[PDB]
Amino acid sequence: SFVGLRVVAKWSSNGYFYSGKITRDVGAGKYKLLFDDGYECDVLGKDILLCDPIPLDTEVTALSEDEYFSAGVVKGHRKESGELYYSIEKEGQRKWYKRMAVILSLEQGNRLREQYGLG
Predict the structure, then answer these.
(1) Same fold for the domain at 1-54 and the one at 55-119?
(2) Boundaries of every domain in the chain
(3) DSSP 99
(4) Angle (nearest 5°) at CA 73 between 65 and 76
(5) Cα 27 vs. chain centroid, distance in angstroms?
(6) DSSP state, 4?
């Protein structure tokens, strides 16, 4: 089963993909998500990416502390005290981000879908 797998799943209201966990197989290719920011909804398996973490070299969207966002490319993954950090490069400079500060726009997630989607 997919229950308890960490994934990055599309939020329909905005098209972006966020980190979360499958909590239930709703059936017929639909899954209950619990996102890490505490929101829940059902998502189609085709909109769920089985990647934990988001892979090296993928273009992502990084959230800055004052509600700005930008694109960046993943250049490293780190674990420390059971938490995941991404190293994200933008214009040749790398900066670390917490898992929750890294999301995928619709065009970024759709690129991963053939390799990682549960469709």
Answers:
(1) yes
(2) 1-54, 55-119
(3) G
(4) 90
(5) 22
(6) T
Type of residue found at 71: A
What is the residue whose two structure tokens read 């209950």? 32
User: What is each CA distance from 22 to 32, 49, 56, 71, 83, in whole angstroms?
Assistant: 6, 11, 23, 26, 19
What DSSP element (H or E) covers 108? helix 106-110
Give the residue among 51, 49, 33 at the shortest CA–CA distance from 41: 33
Give me the resolution in angstroms, 1 decimal. Answer: 1.7
Query: For tokens 């990647």, what's the residue?
Result: 51
- Kindly report the CATH class assigned to 55-119: mainly beta
Domain 1-54 of CATH type 2.30.30.140? yes
Beta strands in 68-107 (DSSP E): 69-80, 83-90, 93-98, 102-103
What is the spatial distance between Cα 17 and Cα 12, in angstroms, rounded to a whole number?
A: 9
Structure tokens at 31: 């899954």
- Beta-bridge partner residues of 6: 21
